[PDB]
Design an enzyme around this catalytic site. Structure first.
Site, short mmCIF file in Angstrom:
data_model
loop_
_atom_site.label_atom_id
_atom_site.label_comp_id
_atom_site.label_asym_id
_atom_site.label_seq_id
_atom_site.Cartn_x
_atom_site.Cartn_y
_atom_site.Cartn_z
N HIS B 351 6.51 11.98 5.64
CA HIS B 351 6.04 10.63 5.85
C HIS B 351 6.14 9.74 4.61
O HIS B 351 5.58 8.68 4.60
CB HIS B 351 4.59 10.68 6.28
CG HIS B 351 4.37 11.34 7.60
ND1 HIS B 351 4.37 10.65 8.78
CD2 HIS B 351 4.15 12.64 7.92
CE1 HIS B 351 4.14 11.47 9.79
NE2 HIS B 351 4.00 12.70 9.30
N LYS B 542 -3.38 -3.40 6.81
CA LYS B 542 -2.87 -2.03 6.52
C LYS B 542 -3.63 -1.59 5.27
O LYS B 542 -4.30 -2.44 4.62
CB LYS B 542 -1.37 -2.05 6.24
CG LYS B 542 -1.00 -3.02 5.13
CD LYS B 542 0.54 -3.19 5.05
CE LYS B 542 1.15 -3.96 6.24
NZ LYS B 542 2.18 -3.07 6.87
N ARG B 543 -3.57 -0.32 4.91
CA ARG B 543 -4.26 0.12 3.68
C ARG B 543 -3.75 -0.70 2.44
O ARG B 543 -2.59 -1.14 2.37
CB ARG B 543 -4.13 1.63 3.49
CG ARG B 543 -4.87 2.48 4.58
CD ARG B 543 -6.43 2.39 4.43
NE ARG B 543 -6.86 3.02 3.16
CZ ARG B 543 -7.35 4.26 3.07
NH1 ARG B 543 -7.53 5.04 4.14
NH2 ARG B 543 -7.68 4.72 1.88
N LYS B 548 2.81 -1.76 -0.79
CA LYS B 548 2.73 -2.60 0.42
C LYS B 548 2.74 -4.08 0.05
O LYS B 548 3.01 -4.96 0.89
CB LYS B 548 1.49 -2.23 1.25
CG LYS B 548 1.58 -0.86 1.93
CD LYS B 548 0.22 -0.33 2.53
CE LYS B 548 0.32 1.06 3.28
NZ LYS B 548 1.20 0.82 4.55
N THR B 650 4.06 1.38 11.32
CA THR B 650 3.80 1.36 12.80
C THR B 650 2.97 0.16 13.18
O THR B 650 3.09 -0.34 14.31
CB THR B 650 3.09 2.60 13.31
OG1 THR B 650 1.96 2.83 12.51
CG2 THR B 650 3.99 3.81 13.22
N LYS B 654 3.19 -2.63 16.45
CA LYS B 654 2.10 -3.13 17.25
C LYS B 654 2.22 -4.65 17.38
O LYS B 654 2.14 -5.24 18.50
CB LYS B 654 0.76 -2.70 16.65
CG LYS B 654 0.53 -1.16 16.58
CD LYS B 654 -0.73 -0.85 15.76
CE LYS B 654 -0.55 0.33 14.83
NZ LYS B 654 -1.84 0.79 14.19
O1 LIG Z 1 -0.57 9.73 3.24
C1 LIG Z 1 0.17 9.14 4.00
N1 LIG Z 1 -0.46 8.22 4.85
C2 LIG Z 1 0.29 7.49 5.74
O2 LIG Z 1 -0.25 6.66 6.45
N2 LIG Z 1 1.68 7.65 5.77
C3 LIG Z 1 2.40 6.82 6.70
O3 LIG Z 1 2.80 7.58 7.89
C4 LIG Z 1 3.11 6.61 8.89
C5 LIG Z 1 3.42 7.50 10.07
O4 LIG Z 1 4.61 8.26 9.84
C6 LIG Z 1 4.36 5.81 8.41
O5 LIG Z 1 4.71 4.85 9.36
C7 LIG Z 1 4.17 5.07 7.07
O6 LIG Z 1 5.44 4.56 6.69
C8 LIG Z 1 3.58 6.07 6.03
O7 LIG Z 1 3.13 5.43 4.83
C9 LIG Z 1 2.31 8.57 4.92
C10 LIG Z 1 1.55 9.32 4.04
CL1 LIG Z 1 2.38 10.49 3.06
#
Ligand SMILES: O=c1[nH]c(=O)n([C@@H]2O[C@H](CO)[C@@H](O)[C@H](O)[C@H]2O)cc1Cl
Ligand SMILES: O=c1[nH]c(=O)n([C@@H]2O[C@H](CO)[C@@H](O)[C@H](O)[C@H]2O)cc1Cl
EC number: 2.4.1.1
Lengths: 810, 810
Positions: B351, B542-543, B548, B650, B654
């Protein structure tokens, strides 16, 4: 099957089966093909709890409408045991459930054995609270049991190599279907902080907050449709609590440790901080709820007409300065009026005269933990000692004896003194104990205010302790006299006219035999232990304590063994001697007594010369549900405390109700039991209280008994020399040492009379008809020892409320 | 009311009302006169859960009978949000509940707002797991989500003086009606100990035991009567645990701290012991259950035909050596066969490519905690590096790069390397991310085994993210094209033929306006915040993470403000700029970015010259249920990560589904979104991945942008000089410092193109008809980004199972 178990109507049974199946499916989310007995228990438990709730809701609404005076029973202990059968019994559902479950192809008795005990108490004091709640609801009083929802109750006891081992009683692992969490009524409780003075009075500030969350459990009366409430508090952290982020979240546990575990010391005070937090927590949260409920009736003068608070020992004695704290600091009543209200509201029950059992809290604890309550207590002490001075001018020694504050290396607050000062009534728990209070520890108080001192002899609920555990005996009683005795136990007196009825004699002896056969079989199936059911069943079950003198029992057992070895071919009445009970974890001597009892069985039970004439069995994990099996199997009840030490006792009553004869000292309620049945129908032996004092004056010298009684010397020599512990010859030198040099309870002084009285019992046992007639005489005179009579006296003479046997509508 | 919400049949409604009232009475033990909305929510929640259970039981029995291949989705995160509406929606009960509750005189929407979110995840990765579970059950796969029942989920975020403050998310205070505790299936998990060698192999001994207790929550598919299971483990102490007696009981908490709290670091690895225990705990307990379930089908060759295990990131990567430990040490398979089985069973999803997010555990941790798993990992490493050596003879540098063991000051185990070695498939989460994996971090692995590497572009569940949160838009879509698109989202393509339909244009714009009006009102009622609903709603939620680039967003906002101050009487398209998201507790820069965002609102929102032309609102406590309100209110979606850093995203999907246009870099799934809608229907700006590498080679020098862009220099000067923090003029010197000297993400490099692209968006906004037509073009091409398409690709190309849209019988 049996008559006193209610109707199994077609409509009722059909209904129960459908609700059973509904809960199996919807509540348990199981299908008949993977359900285990434990799932079946739960489906039954939820099906029976459904019948309670309607009654529960209507009882609680009826009180809100009619607004009677409410009784608040505060206790750190509620020893409830199991709930399912008791609920069936009080709701007349027992035969129907039996039928309904039999038709689903299940055995209700099998299912009942799956329920964990609610072991939220230690022994007599926490079980008294449990019988009381049942009696309060049977008698229609608007009463609430308040305490603490411990996450771990009394430890489960395992015997390993003859030694007690403790393990955590994780009673909530599978859920408790009886309780309803009530997070919506969560309440704050304050600790630490400091006291500020303003122009508007004292203010308690910078405190830590622990939330108290209530769990409600229904308490049904006997077939009267009353369901009262037991509300138990659970500790929770607030949400901003300490708020590493991670560590801050984990440290929420420090707060919730308050309701984690029941302290397992019975009749012994341990002054530990965690205990005092528990004490304040139950009292703080309970008093807000009380006051909330009162304000939904401004005017505090009427407070004592609407509220009674009973203090179960000094454990909730902080109720007294807390009620003052609320009235004076929060509601702004003046001191004198707050004090009048508090005295008229509180009453205190004492359960002991043992020095070591009394709570005396170090002042440095209260200072850190509850600095405002310390201030209030010093003020209570000063005004109180001014009344003493005014009444006994010049008597300086009285002032120091009566003070709420004990001086010494560490200053302490004597919590009993606080209770007597702030209560309108103080009571002992049997007539002799109440007398001892007035002549000894509370003499000074009694001379000051004789009108506070009362007696309320203890009792036991005939529902649990007769109908529930002994259906066979309830049933033959009911054939002759009807059913009304279950809520009017004085009616058992009618059984006296059956003392010479041959058919009745035979039905009593038959019920006993059946109970003994069923208990013999519970022993083998669940513990691979192997007994003659024709033997006299000699039973001493209660917490292990030196004053209870299980050691005296032990010496008798060894004497019988030695008399068999000396004349093997002489006949003796065979006995199964059973001793059971938990020892508190740090009570070293109590643990040694358990080890001796097993060491004795090790020798006795494998001596081929003894045959099946003598067996000594230590009953493991004694607790409420085990009491319900062993007490109706008992022929002989051992109640052998040194006279003056057992405040009442209540095991003694359970046995008398269930057709065991009693061998006992004149101690506690034993005195009233004998007076009710006739001394001829009781096996009394040993020192009276008067004899003990005479011996204390001269000085107790145990060597004197050892020099004059060869049978006793041989036991002591067998103890010292390793006869009961061949690989550790000095295992028991602590006991021998204590018995010889430091025996606070005079085991040797009563030995001789105890053995001779034990021969008089074997002799009646040889004459079944005459044993059984004396039994009937006991059963028939046990009426006084019902908790309904006890609670009626509290209600009339302490709480100012009138009991009522009237059914509420269904 | 609305068509896609199902039937409100007379019989259904009548039934719901009676069950609602049954639960109110029997389950809640409340009467209509004291029930609060929270009690009404619970009565509804239990009434809806009743409809699940029959389906739940029959689904789980159907799998036992038919025995299909099972999918085990292991994840430390399941970000579920609320369950009630989703359950209504998937069961077609929504209109009936609305009706039934309306007739009891209640408002179902009011009630839904009382449910706590299950916040058991951090953001995109834990929410992907949640969408996936829903898609797996919608598509009839026999799939089980396994993880950890955290007692505290992600913290609730409060803003205080503009600063984030954390508080514990006590989501279980009031109970969770959806879960069923399953204490009967409790399982042991081992920690510490040491490894013994016997003649019969290795043995792991002297371990500490923590029990894992399962809680099951039902996962309903969309109107297909499939209900799958999410099983989450809770940590419990054993009963002999440490067994002061009191202290021994309290220390049971050390064991149960394992499931206490979710670690709140997203895209950042924190190598803490408590985390690794959580990782092992979920994997240990899950694998026993898997194996148990498999043995109720001796022969392990068929294991990979009966079991698939998906690893959600490296978090459950210990599944790999644990499966070896069980096969080799417990079942006595030989190494080579155990390894074949393990590879054929496991697959791994990556991820992220951020260096700091990768798990590399210190060897000294694994050694103390899991000494056998370390041994297995060294053996896996050796055999693996022998295959590398055999394939690239002489290439010593490849051996060190590919090793599972990183050398250095502290040796570490690279958990991603472990996963690639022990999995038959590894996949990225968008096409570009998958390509980057093969060209960069996993290049060496790819050359070794190119056939493991796959793409599975992420998706979102159209149930939650369309039908549940945007009924208005679902409804007008359904008027034109029918209902089938809800489980076949590719059908949205038919909407392209309505792009020039005047009535449709007007219904899309009307749904958006209504959503914006409802969100404007949620803002004022619940947070006293005050907005123009005619403004363009510009949203970045988003976080908070540097990659970001919320900071880029910030600079744009300040540029607009400065352009208004410079020419106040010039017209601008008014915007409401909303930024929301949680910062992990120790991420200092993330916390400063939140503080800047609020400091900006403080200036902008109270400038009387600005009027209502610009508002900056920080959305507090962003989480799933807040996403469901704000996403359908959005006109503009900010997806502005530096290209190459956001693996998929994601949120972006949405928003596209809900009628917002996107402004974004060519990053993650943005690339496929644009390719699906046409680049003309998307606002793309800034560096591509190629441009970023070019810049990294020369070297990124930020001073260069600051010297050439007066508008940018003025912002930086306003930041340094205290314009946004007048009482603390140097509040933001950390940010300025980082932006000027240490910016890993090149905020200044994309600033210019971002601002100009922001003008192109305001210009289309001026032409409502043409804005709305581009919106329709997006909505209509969003079909690919359904999680049903994603899971179907996993099922076909990774798990070897065939999806099915067939209803199971009711
Ligand atoms: O610790 C994490 N937390 C997270 O939300 N993602 C996310 O995973 C999401 C699902 O794959 C993805 O869309 C996004 O690009 C990633 O940042 C990945 C890691 Cl490694
Ligand atoms: O800590 C205690 N635990 C207890 O069981 N009792 C008992 O309380 C019982 C109930 O009053 C009573 O019958 C018995 O005589 C007492 O020993 C008293 C104290 Cl102080």
């Amino acid at each position: 099957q049996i008559s006193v178990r209610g109707l199994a109507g077609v409509e009722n049974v059909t209904e129960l089966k459908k609700n059973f199946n509904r809960h199996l499916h919807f509540t348990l989310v199981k299908d008949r093909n993977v359900a285990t007995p434990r799932d079946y228990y739960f489906a039954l438990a939820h099906t029976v709890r459904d019948h309670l709730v309607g009654r529960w809701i209507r009882t609680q609404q009826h009180y809100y409408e009619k607004d009677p005076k409410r009784i608040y029973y505060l206790s750190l202990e509620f020893y409830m045991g199991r709930t399912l059968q008791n609920t069936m019994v009080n709701l007349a559902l027992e035969n129907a459930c039996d039928e309904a479950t039999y038709q689903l192809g299940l055995d209700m008795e099998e299912l009942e054995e799956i329920e964990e005990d609610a072991g939220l108490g230690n022994g007599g004091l926490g079980r008294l609270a449990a019988c009381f709640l049942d009696s309060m609801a049977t008698l229609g009083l608007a009463a609430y049991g308040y305490g603490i929802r411990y996450e771990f109750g009394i430890f489960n006891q395992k015997i390993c190599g003859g030694w007690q081992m403790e393990e955590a009683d994780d009673w909530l692992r599978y859920g408790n279907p009886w309780e309803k969490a009530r997070p919506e009524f969560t309440l704050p409780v304050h600790f630490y902080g400091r006291v500020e003075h303003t122009s508007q009075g004292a203010k308690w500030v910078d405190t830590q907050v622990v939330l108290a969350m209530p769990y409600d459990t229904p308490v049904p009366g006997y077939r009267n449709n009353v369901v009262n409430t037991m509300r138990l508090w659970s500790a929770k952290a607030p949400n901003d609590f300490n708020l590493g982020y991670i560590q801050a979240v984990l440290d929420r546990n420090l707060a919730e440790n308050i309701s984690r575990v029941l302290y397992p010391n019975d009749n012994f005070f341990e002054g530990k901080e965690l205990r005092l937090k528990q004490e304040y927590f139950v009292v703080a949260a309970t008093l807000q709820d009380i006051i909330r409920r009162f304000k939904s009736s401004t005017n505090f003068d009427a407070f004592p007409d609407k509220v009674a608070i009973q203090l179960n020992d000094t454990h909730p004695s902080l109720a007294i300065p807390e009620l003052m704290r609320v009235l004076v600091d929060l509601e702004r009543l003046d001191w004198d009026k707050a004090w009048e209200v508090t005295v008229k509201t509180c009453a205190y029950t004492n359960h002991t005269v043992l020095p070591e059992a009394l709570e005396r809290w170090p002042v440095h604890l209260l200072e850190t933990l509850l600095p405002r309550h310390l201030q209030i207590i010093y003020e209570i002490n000063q005004r109180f000692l001014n009344r003493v001075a005014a009444a006994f001018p010049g008597d300086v020694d009285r002032l120091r004896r009566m003070s709420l504050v004990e001086e010494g290396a560490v200053k302490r607050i004597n919590m009993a003194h606080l209770c007597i000062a702030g209560s309108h009534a103080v009571n002992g728990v049997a007539r002799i104990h109440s007398e001892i209070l007035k002549k000894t520890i509370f003499k000074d108080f009694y001379e000051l205010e004789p009108h506070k001192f009362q007696n309320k002899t203890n009792g036991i609920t005939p529902r649990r302790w007769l109908v529930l555990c002994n259906p066979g005996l309830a049933e033959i009683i009911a054939e002759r006299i009807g059913e009304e005795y279950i809520s009017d136990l004085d009616q058992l007196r009618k059984l006296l006219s059956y003392v010479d009825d041959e058919a009745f004699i035979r039905d009593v002896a038959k019920v006993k035999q059946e109970n003994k056969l069923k208990f013999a079989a519970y022993l083998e199936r669940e513990y691979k232990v192997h007994i003659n059911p024709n033997s006299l069943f000699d039973v001493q079950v209660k917490r292990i304590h030196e004053y209870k003198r299980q050691l005296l029992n032990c010496l008798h057992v060894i004497t019988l063994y030695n008399r068999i070895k000396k004349e093997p071919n002489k006949f003796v009445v065979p006995r199964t001697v059973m001793i059971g009970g938990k020892a508190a974890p740090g009570y070293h001597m109590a643990k040694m007594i358990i080890k001796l009892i097993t060491a004795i069985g090790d020798v006795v039970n494998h001596d081929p010369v003894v045959g099946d004439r003598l067996r000594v069995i230590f009953l493991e994990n004694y607790r409420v549900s085990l009491a319900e099996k062993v007490i109706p199997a008992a022929d002989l009840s051992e109640q052998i405390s040194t006279a003056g030490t057992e405040a009442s006792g209540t095991g003694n009553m359970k046995f008398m109700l269930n057709g065991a004869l009693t061998i006992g000292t004149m101690d506690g309620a034993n005195v009233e039991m004998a007076e009710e049945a006739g001394e001829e129908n009781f096996f009394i032996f040993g020192m009276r209280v008067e004899d003990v004092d005479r011996l204390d004056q001269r000085g107790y010298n145990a060597q004197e008994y050892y020099d004059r009684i060869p049978e006793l010397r041989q036991i002591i020599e067998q103890l010292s020399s390793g006869f009961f512990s061949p690989k550790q010859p000095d295992l028991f030198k602590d006991i021998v040492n204590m018995l010889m040099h430091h025996d606070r309870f005079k085991v040797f002084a009563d030995y001789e009379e105890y053995v001779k009285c034990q021969e008089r019992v074997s002799a009646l046992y040889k004459n079944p008809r005459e044993w059984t007639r004396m039994v009937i005489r006991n059963i028939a005179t046990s009426g006084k020892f019902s908790s309904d009579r006890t609670i009626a006296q509290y209600a009339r003479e302490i709480w100012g409320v009138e009991p009522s046997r009237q059914r509420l509508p269904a």
